[PDB]
């Protein structure tokens, strides 16, 4: 079943019906005995409870953003730095 634990790496998890990708990490949210998973102020399933160990974990987004290139110009140099 490969019910392992990979913390702090972007993986593509699949719980008991809970699919998706992201970086996994331990949570500290106050559940109930009948909670299974929680959601944020948005409509994303944020936190998760282990079907195997009943551990409260929260799910973070993997990685994204924009790229901006920094140049001093062509007639002087050619090296650049990123952001």
């Amino acid at each position: 079943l490969s019910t392992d634990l990979i913390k702090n790496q972007c993986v593509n998890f699949n719980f008991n019906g809970l699919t998706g990708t992201g970086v996994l990490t331990p949570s500290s949210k106050r559940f109930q005995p009948f909670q299974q998973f929680g959601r944020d102020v948005s409509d994303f399933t944020d936190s998760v409870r282990d079907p195997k160990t009943s551990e409260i974990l929260d799910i973070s987004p993997c990685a994204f953003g924009g790229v901006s290139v920094i140049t001093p110009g062509t007639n002087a140099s050619s090296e650049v730095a990123v952001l």
Partner: protein, 285 residues
């Protein structure tokens, strides 16, 4: 063994108020520090609550319609309300499910029961234990069976205040029967008081049967029959819009109807419990 009673008073249909009860956890999903709209079956605030009182010569449990899903409350000190039959025809012609507490187990059983017209437990009033299980005469084509853990329940008749307030909601959707539970301690004589308690889901039972009516299974206290003071309260649900309030500990702390007045419906739109002065726009007429 089907035993009907001799001198039962006709039912009261005495109406009471629904003030702020009927709150349940709608799902299994955690939220916190938030407000949240729902469109689901609910008891509206401050509504007609039919109180069926079991008093000295009054044994009220007729055939009661489930029509849309029901709200139930039980004002208890001696555990008179112990079970229910759910179904449509309330005979052995259609499948009936019976969920009882027989003072040993929570027993769930769905068969074609030959319904006794008067379901009750008989309890010896000077002895203090259950004597009879006069529920059903026959049972066949049993679809579902459940018997819970063995536990010792308080059966004998008590005196004084109603101490125990058990609130139940039953909800047929997608072939299930959603079963809701909640309890608070009380102390009152009659007339189910105001309060605010979120009910908790306990069972989502794949029955798949036509349930239109029901009848509670009460407990006769006998020195054939005799009764003691107990009351149970009839509530229908209606598809409403409420808004919940989650704290930092994920507790439902406040609820608000969007339908009782233009005031609270505005509070559903503005999404705060407090609004200062001014004029605000809501939907069309």
């Amino acid at each position: 063994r089907c035993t009907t009673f001799d001198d039962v008073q006709a039912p009261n249909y005495t109406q009471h108020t629904s003030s702020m009860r009927g709150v349940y956890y709608p799902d299994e999903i955690f939220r916190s520090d938030t407000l949240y709209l729902t469109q689901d079956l609910f008891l509206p605030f401050y509504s007609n609550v039919t109180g069926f009182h079991t008093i000295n010569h009054t044994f009220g449990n007729p055939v009661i319609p489930f029509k849309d899903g029901i709200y139930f409350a039980a004002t208890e000190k001696s555990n008179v309300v112990r079970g229910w039959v759910f179904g449509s025809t309330m005979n052995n012609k259609s499948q009936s499910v019976i969920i009882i507490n027989n003072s040993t187990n929570v027993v769930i059983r769905a068969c074609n029961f030959e319904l006794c017209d008067n379901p009750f437990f008989a309890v010896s009033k000077p002895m203090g234990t259950q004597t009879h299980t006069m529920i059903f005469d026959n049972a066949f084509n049993c679809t579902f069976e459940y018997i819970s853990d063995a536990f010792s329940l308080d059966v004998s008749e008590k005196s004084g205040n109603f101490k125990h307030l058990r609130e139940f909601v039953f909800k047929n959707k997608d072939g299930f029967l959603y079963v809701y539970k909640g309890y608070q301690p009380i102390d009152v004589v009659r007339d189910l008081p105001s309060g605010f308690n979120t009910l908790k889901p306990i069972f989502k039972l794949p029955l798949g049967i036509n349930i239109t009516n029901f009848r509670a299974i009460l407990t006769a206290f006998s020195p054939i029959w005799g009764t003691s003071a107990a009351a149970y309260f009839v509530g229908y649900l209606k598809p409403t819009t409420f808004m919940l309030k989650y704290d930092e500990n994920g507790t439902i702390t406040d609820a608000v109807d969007c339908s009782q007045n233009p005031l609270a419906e505005l509070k559903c739109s503005v999404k705060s419990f407090e609004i200062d002065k001014g004029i605000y726009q809501t939907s069309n007429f």
